[PDB]
Amino acid sequence: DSKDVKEWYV
Amino acid sequence: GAMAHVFPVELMKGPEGLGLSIIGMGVGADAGLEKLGIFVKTITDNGAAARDGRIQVNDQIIEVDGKSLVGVTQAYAASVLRNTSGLVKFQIGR
Ligand SMILES: [Cl-]
Ligand SMILES: [Zn+2]
């Protein structure tokens, strides 16, 4: 589900 | 106010990156990886975005260096952001 997707660092 | 707040931000990339993390928000009914918008989840202490001070958690990154981040995968958006160099130009929504 979208709600637990990890953030991506930039 | 009732209207969206969209503003430009220009800052210099740091040696450790832009100093923020992104998440997507919104999908299509097909449930593929395209995200409707890209938003700031965290800002890194002492990083370029923090030092500049303008970008905040929950801001939308609408566009960077002329590349739209509307209707794109999270991987695409992050890759665009990671390929920035030197002066970086953003459109930010709040
Ligand atoms: Cl976006
Ligand atoms: Zn999930």
Task: Tokens for A4, please give them.
Answer: 């637990």
**Which residues on chain A are in Cβ contact (under 8 Å) with B21?**
7-10
CATH number at residue B6: 2.30.42.10
Using a CB–CB cutoff of 8 Å, tell me whether B57 touches chain A.
Answer: no
C-alpha distance from residue B14 to each of B43, B44, B50, B84, B85 (Å): 13, 11, 11, 10, 9
Using a CB–CB cutoff of 8 Å, tell me whether B48 touches chain A.
Answer: no
Using left for φ > 0, alpha for ψ between -120 and 50, and beta otherwise, residue B17 falls in left
Where in the sequence is the domain holding B2, given as residue range(s)?
1-94
**B45 C-alpha to center of ligand 1: Å?**
23
Phi, psi of B74 (to 5 degrees): -60, -40
The total number of structural domains in chain B stands at 1
Known binding-site residue numbers of A:
1, 4
- CB contact under 8 Å between B21 and A10, yes or no, is yes
* Greatest extent of chain B over all pairs of C-alpha atoms, in Å: 40
